[PDB]
């Protein structure tokens, strides 16, 4: 029986021994999986909150782990007020560890208590505490509550700004503190203020870790709050062509990959032109391969029709088609094939044979080595020539002939 098993693991949490008590606490998610009944999940969560209120910090951490593992079941408790109140009663503990665990509880419960103002005030007060674990837990709770509540976000944006430009805050806690601005995707003026703060923040703290974290949270804000995307793309391209560090360029590359995977239609022709110009004058194959991966992701979408003779993208694809790196060759062949099968202009008749012979050269390079990385480029090339044969029928004879000669 459900209630019989509930009593069976309920008798263990007055055992006095901490081991059987943590036993009793951590058996709860299995009970929630077996018996998803709201009147029973309610009673289980209320007594979990009671043993959270009276237990030590390890029991509180066990309750926190249970709450994290049972996030989909805590929307069906419906005695929210007294449960949250008896958890919240030990925000007033003088123990900073207990305060940190309660902040992690509030952040874990932020899906079912948005606009709960005493929780917001506790997070705001604990963000200025002198204990590192409490401040980290307050940052975690603020990140959770900013995602679930816009009234929390509008004031906490100003607070996080003022404690980022506050130099008493150390650099590592600043690094943990930047991605709160990712959840500013509630209001247009809120996202604009967050973008202004991030623009001042990148040039104010030009550290490599700072620019990685700030650019990634700026692009997560731009992807979530959709009216930020062209300026974010042009900012990423500017930081890809100007910032000399390889890590910053690598984040710019993977970030433009994310933005091309999400919203390829919002790329302008100038953005593709700037990315191509970045791929021309780079000396590193590790960055050129990533840039060509972004351009090959863009090539399989409608961004080519927005981009469109022989342009910088075509010249770049021809140059990267004949490259000693197999990945760069595969990406250039993919761009050439997508351009060839995308439209039927007069200019692509010349590069059709270029795509065919680049495919054949990639086949003769990727077949005799049996490397694990060679098979991926071989699969890319063979998929590209399948697409070339299907999209344009007449030249399939040469593709079949070179496959037979390579076999």
């Amino acid at each position: 029986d459900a209630n019989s098993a509930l009593m069976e693991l309920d008798k263990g949490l007055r055992s006095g021994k901490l081991g059987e008590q943590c036993e009793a606490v951590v058996r709860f998610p299995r009970l929630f999986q077996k018996y998803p009944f709201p009147i029973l999940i309610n009673s289980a969560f209320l007594k979990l909150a009671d043993v959270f209120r009276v237990g030590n910090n390890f029991l509180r951490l066990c309750v926190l782990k249970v709450t994290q593992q049972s996030e989909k079941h805590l929307e069906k408790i419906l005695n929210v007020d007294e449960f949250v109140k008896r958890i919240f009663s030990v925000i007033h503990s003088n123990d900073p560890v207990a305060r940190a665990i309660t902040l992690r509880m509030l952040g874990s419960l932020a899906s079912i208590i948005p606009e709960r103002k005493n929780a917001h005030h506790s997070i705001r007060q604990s963000l200025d505490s002198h204990d590192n674990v409490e401040v980290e837990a307050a940052v975690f709770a603020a990140a959770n509550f900013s995602a679930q509540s816009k009234d929390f976000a509008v004031g906490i944006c100003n607070k996080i700004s003022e404690m980022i430009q506050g130099l008493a805050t150390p650099v590592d806690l600043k690094l943990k503190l930047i991605p709160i601005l990712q959840h500013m995707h509630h209001d247009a003026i809120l996202a604009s203020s967050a973008r202004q703060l991030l623009q001042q923040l990148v040039t104010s703290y030009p550290s490599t870790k700072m620019v990685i974290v700030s650019l990634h949270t700026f692009t997560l804000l731009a992807a979530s709050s959709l009216v930020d995307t062209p300026k974010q793309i042009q900012l990423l391209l500017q930081y890809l062509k100007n910032d000399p560090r390889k890590a910053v360029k690598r984040l710019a590359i993977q970030d433009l990959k994310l933005l091309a995977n999400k919203t390829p239609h919002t790329w302008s022709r100038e953005n593709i032109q700037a990315l191509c110009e970045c791929a021309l004058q780079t000396p590193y194959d590790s960055l050129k391969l990533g840039m060509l991966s972004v351009l090959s992701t863009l090539s399989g979408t409608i961004a080519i029709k927005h981009y469109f003779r022989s342009s910088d993208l075509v010249k770049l694809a021809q140059e990267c088609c004949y490259h000693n790196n197999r990945g760069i060759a595969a990406h250039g062949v993919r761009v050439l094939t997508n351009i060839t099968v995308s439209c039927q202009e007069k200019d692509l008749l010349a590069l059709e044979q270029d795509a065919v012979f680049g495919l054949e050269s990639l086949l003769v390079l990727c077949s005799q080595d049996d490397s694990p990385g060679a098979q991926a480029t071989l699969k890319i090339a063979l998929n590209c020539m399948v697409k070339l044969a299907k999209g344009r029928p007449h030249l399939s004879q040469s593709v079949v002939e070179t496959l037979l000669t390579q076999l």
């Binding site: 209120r53 008896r86 009663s89 030990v90 007033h92 503990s93 003088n94 123990d95 207990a98």
Partner: peptide, 13 residues
Amino acid sequence: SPSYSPTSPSYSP
């Protein structure tokens, strides 16, 4: 209780 300040708000069940 050692975990709470004397001036901390009381808990009323």
